[PDB]
Amino acid sequence: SQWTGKPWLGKWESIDGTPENWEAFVKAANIPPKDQALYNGKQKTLLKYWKEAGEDHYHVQTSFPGTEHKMETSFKMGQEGTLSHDGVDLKYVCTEDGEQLITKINIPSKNQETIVTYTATGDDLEQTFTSNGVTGKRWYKKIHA
Ligand SMILES: [Zn+2]
Ligand SMILES: [Zn+2]
């Protein structure tokens, strides 16, 4: 059978600065100032994806060290999940295209969809996100912890 790589598995730290095309994305995707703040300034994002051997699901954890905006959940490929933040529901489905993780997101209350892709090779991860026709790109470095 096929050898498979999932290079997005691991822990990741956002590189210094704002995502590529951030200004345009903020405007088009109508990112509120409260959400903007988490990606502006010295604030880091930590992202962790993992799979334990004997389970049929993946785990994800995001944290913004210094703040209380954390997320921790599990998902199965192709199966819908729902998350909520400050009373706003987000529906998502994760899939794979070869080595790339794809997350399709819908926010019904805003009539807004986002697609996020995670493309990694070795110590580097590119997170591409598109919403309302505008694409931003954020880079992360692999970290041990
Ligand atoms: Zn588990
Ligand atoms: Zn929050």
Numbering used by the authors: 27 to 171
What text appears in the publication on this structure?
Secretory abundant heat soluble (SAHS) protein is one of them and is constantly expressed at high levels in Ramazzottius varieornatus. A previous crystallographic study revealed that a SAHS protein (RvSAHS1) from one of the toughest tardigrades, Ramazzottius varieornatus, has a β‐barrel architecture similar to fatty acid binding proteins (FABPs) and two putative ligand binding sites (LBS1 and LBS2) where fatty acids can bind. However, some SAHS proteins such as RvSAHS4 have different sets of amino acid residues at LBS1 and LBS2, implying that they prefer other ligands and have different functions.
The RvSAHS4 structure was refined at 1.5 Å resolution. However, MolB in the RvSAHS4 structure had a 310 helix (η1) following αII and MolA also had a helix‐like structure in the same region [Fig. 1(C)]. While LBS1 in RvSAHS1 possesses an endogenous FA molecule originating from Escherichia coli in the crystal structure, no electron density corresponding to an FA molecule was observed around LBS1 in RvSAHS4. Residues located at LBS2 in RvSAHS4 were also distinct from those in RvSAHS1. Therefore, we modeled short PEG molecules contained in the crystallization solution (triethylene glycol in MolA and tetraethylene glycol in MolB) [Fig. 2(C), S2, Supporting Information]. The terminal oxygen atom of the PEG molecules could form hydrogen bonds with Thr129, Tyr75, and a nearby water molecule. Our observation that LBS1 in RvSAHS4 is blocked by Tyr65 and that PEG molecules were found at LBS2 suggests that RvSAHS4 mainly uses LBS2 to capture ligands.
